[PDB]
Nucleic acid binder design. Structure first.
Ligand SMILES: [Co+2]
Ligand SMILES: [Co+2]
Ligand SMILES: [Co+2]
Ligand SMILES: [Mg+2]
Ligand SMILES: [Mg+2]
Ligand SMILES: [Mg+2]
Ligand SMILES: [Mg+2]
Lengths: 220, 222
DNA sequence: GGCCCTCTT
DNA sequence: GGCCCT
């Protein structure tokens, strides 16, 4: 349990929204030691400048071929499609991907905590569903997770708690590369660099094992 | 298809208590106002800006009880509710006890089933508190088989801003509520807010009603 | 799809 | 009724 040593910012892109029984099309992890986060110094400004990511970070970004077509809306905003992913030789969500995730997580200082925007309702349940289809034991065993919407709400102290709304509320600039996995992870990181010590305290208190996350859907 | 069928009775509920959740509060007052769904189906459409406060239905069952808590009220609680443990006892009020459970069961039992409790911030206060108080008793729960919904969630859906009871009431009707922080007063205020868009409320309630047995107690007890 | 709706005394 | 995720 806490204190959490590493925060792993997570974002998934997929074929659609949960009622559609979606499948992952892109995945990004950005791992940062809690020290790098608290070391961030939001410079003077009105609006405050967007902080640079810490120098020392681990990053993984992967495109994934789904077993079903993206919804038109999902394709439009992500810039991905099943057809393009296939011709670019992307592989399905498979055992080897699970091995990659575990190895990546395992070289992070422990314990780790996944951080995703609306994670409790989307990213974590969806990820649980994808992993459940595999033969590998869950690569996220021992890993914790929190939802940054819950975090940001509690840290205050609004019309919207969407990723973009929060970012703009803080920095009054548009996020870049929205609805791309890496783009959204970097945006989330910038938000979480605003008041890192308060965030880390909240994370330490509210982090729960990823293994407690119920799958989005069950594929009986 | 509706998850639990039509809710035939809406039971507007409010509690007064010794304090707020972190204090392990105990109930000091309880009011139930039971209304057949038809009384809501029969409520007039709210027209005008502002509309008048809806007329309460003629046919209603009401229960309002003052209850001696097991601990003193916080000074803040006493100030706003006008109740204190000592004075409730001077007035000979009984504790939240087996008798009360039997009373509540009988009251609910002559309502058409199923019943759905409606309380403002009920999901985070009234329902968990009531669950805790009933859990203390050896008597079986009189609320098994009943459903519940939070009217904050309801009014947010219906309004499509503060969502305190008084704020909503004032926003809809341009009037100050009366007898705030009394159980019966707040129940009548709640009734009025829920009568604003009565057909839409009923549909939302039917869609979001959840079994009371799924409500987690506010706090644990020896 | 599931839960949240920051108020409650 | 819509968040909020795609
Ligand atoms: Co679409
Ligand atoms: Co009937
Ligand atoms: Co209506
Ligand atoms: Mg996302
Ligand atoms: Mg994204
Ligand atoms: Mg109340
Ligand atoms: Mg009250």
């Amino acid at each position: 349990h806490g204190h959490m040593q590493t925060l792993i910012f997570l974002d998934l892109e997929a074929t659609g929204l949960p009622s559609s029984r979606p499948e992952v099309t892109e995945l990004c992890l950005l791992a940062v030691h809690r020290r790098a986060l608290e070391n961030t110094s939001i410079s003077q400004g009105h609006p405050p400048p967007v902080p640079r990511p810490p120098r020392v970070v681990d990053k993984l970004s992967l495109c994934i071929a789904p077993g079903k077509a993206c919804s038109p809306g999902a394709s439009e905003i992500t810039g991905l499609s099943k057809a393009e992913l296939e011709v670019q030789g992307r592989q399905r969500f498979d055992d080897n991907l699970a091995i990659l995730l575990r190895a990546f997580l395992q070289r992070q200082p422990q314990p780790c905590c996944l951080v995703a925007h609306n994670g409790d309702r989307y990213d974590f349940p969806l990820l649980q569903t994808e992993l459940a289809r595999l033969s590998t034991p869950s690569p996220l065993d021992g890993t914790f997770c929190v939802d940054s919407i819950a975090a940001l709400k509690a840290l205050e102290q609004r019309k919207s708690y969407s990723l973009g709304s929060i970012y703009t509320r803080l920095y009054w600039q548009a996020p870049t590369d929205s609805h791309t996995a890496e783009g959204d992870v970097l945006t989330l990181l910038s938000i979480c660099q605003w008041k890192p010590q308060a965030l880390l305290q909240w994370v330490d208190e509210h982090a729960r094992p990823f293994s407690t996350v119920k799958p989005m859907y069950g594929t009986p």
